[PDB]
Design a binder for this molecule. Structure first.
Ligand code: ATP
Lengths: 14, 372
């Protein structure tokens, strides 16, 4: 399972 | 004086409530163990968990549990099933009595026990007299024929028997089993909501439960196989920590909306339980927001399938409904009114000493088990 954050392309906020 | 003990068995928490007739005599929430994805995978642990709740309830009461138990549980296997029962009295008209209605409903229940399923809830949906007259209440009316359409919420016998057998070995009292999702809806909805149309989204642990009411009864029941467990998993994965530290962070600092969040460093432990690590409230919320957005986007399909058969909007329930600002997110995704469901905001009289639990979306089913 890939966390939703990546699948929604919000990982730039990490 | 009449007492009720209501237990709601969730995958993460077991909720307990003792009500007397209204006042709350005792209430507690204990960690649920031995249930893994709606199946009892450790009966020993499960029994321990239940006993822990019973002991806490007794400790609060200072008296042995003497009531009727109503106990609800969650399962992805609940479904809607309908049946019709008819009476044909012949060439003479007869009064429709309580005995007749009781008999017809008992008969519906026996008829719904088939194809490996068994009913937990039954609702009288339509009443038709003499093949032409639709009435709202058949009682005391005279007719040559009556036909009643029932709608029910059923569950596989194997699932039912699993819970029933273990509970009867642990709860030393007669009890009735119910659907936690149905009881949740019964615990939070107002009468006009149930009449005109409304959808309950229950943000539970293993999955997200979905139930729609119209004309006073459930019309659709389903689920999305994504829940708060996946929110916790995502945080553990991204922040590289344990499930329990992740849960602590979410409960303590989580928000469904991240864009406007102030810079706020927060500490947590690594898997070693000692190494201190640091993130921000904003980053934590981004991880939560994304998974919550997924849950709601997937629930929209249900919303649209119902949007063919929504005045009352969406009522969020369960543990997830407590995430700060989740209603904002939902409103944006569902494009409709959204509110938090709890017993207090249903259309029913306040209950003495219930302040702490009446406003808790987590205790909705516990209340609903009783006020059905
Ligand atoms: N105050 C809170 N704020 C944010 N999240 C919460 C809060 N309380 C609980 N949660 C989340 O909700 C989850 C438990 O909620 P809930 O009581 O619906 O679970 P459950 O009833 O055991 O689940 P299910 O009904 O699916 O069996 C926890 O995993 C936690 O992540």
């Amino acid at each position: 399972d890939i966390p939703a954050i990546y699948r929604y392309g919000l990982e730039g906020l990490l | 004086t009449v007492f009720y003990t209501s237990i709601d068995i969730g995958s993460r928490y077991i909720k307990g409530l003792v009500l007397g007739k209204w006042e709350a005599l005792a209430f507690s929430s204990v960690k649920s163990r031995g249930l893994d994805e709606g199946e009892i995978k450790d009966a020993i642990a499960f029994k321990e968990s239940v006993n822990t709740l019973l002991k806490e309830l007794e400790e609060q009461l200072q008296k042995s549990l003497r009531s009727d138990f109503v106990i609800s549980f969650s399962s992805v296997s609940f479904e809607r099933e309908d049946t019709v029962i008819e009476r044909d009295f012949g060439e003479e008209k007869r009064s429709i009595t309580l005995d007749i209605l009781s008999e017809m409903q008992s008969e519906a229940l026996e008829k719904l026990k088939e194809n490996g399923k068994t009913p937990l809830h039954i609702f009288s949906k339509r009443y038709l007299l003499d093949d032409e007259r639709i009435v709202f209440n058949p009682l005391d009316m005279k007719a040559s024929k009556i036909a009643i359409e029932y709608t029910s919420i059923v569950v596989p016998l194997k699932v039912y028997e699993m819970f029933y057998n273990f509970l009867q070995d642990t709860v030393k009292s007669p009890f009735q089993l119910k659907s936690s999702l149905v009881s949740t809806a019964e615990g939070v909805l107002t009468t006009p909501e149930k009449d005109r149309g409304v959808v309950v989204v229950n943000l539970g642990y293993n999955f997200t439960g979905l139930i729609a009411y119209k004309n006073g009864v459930p019309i659709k029941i389903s689920y999305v196989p994504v829940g708060m467990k996946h929110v916790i998993k995502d945080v553990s994965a991204v922040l590289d920590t344990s499930f329990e530290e992740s849960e602590r962070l979410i409960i303590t600092h989580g928000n469904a909306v991240y864009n406007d969040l102030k810079e706020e460093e927060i500490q947590y432990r690594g898997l070693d339980g000692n190494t201190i690590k640091t993130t921000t409230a904003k980053k934590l919320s981004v991880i939560i927001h994304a998974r919550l957005r997924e849950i709601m986007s997937k629930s929209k399909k249900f919303f649209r399938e119902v949007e063919a058969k929504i005045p009352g909007g969406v009522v969020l329930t369960g543990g997830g409904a407590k995430i700060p600002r989740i209603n904002e997110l939902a409103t944006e995704v569902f494009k409709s009114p959204v509110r938090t469901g709890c017993y207090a905001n249903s259309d029913r009289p306040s209950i003495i000493n219930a302040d702490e639990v009446a406003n808790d979306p987590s205790f909705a089913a516990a209340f609903g088990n009783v006020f059905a």
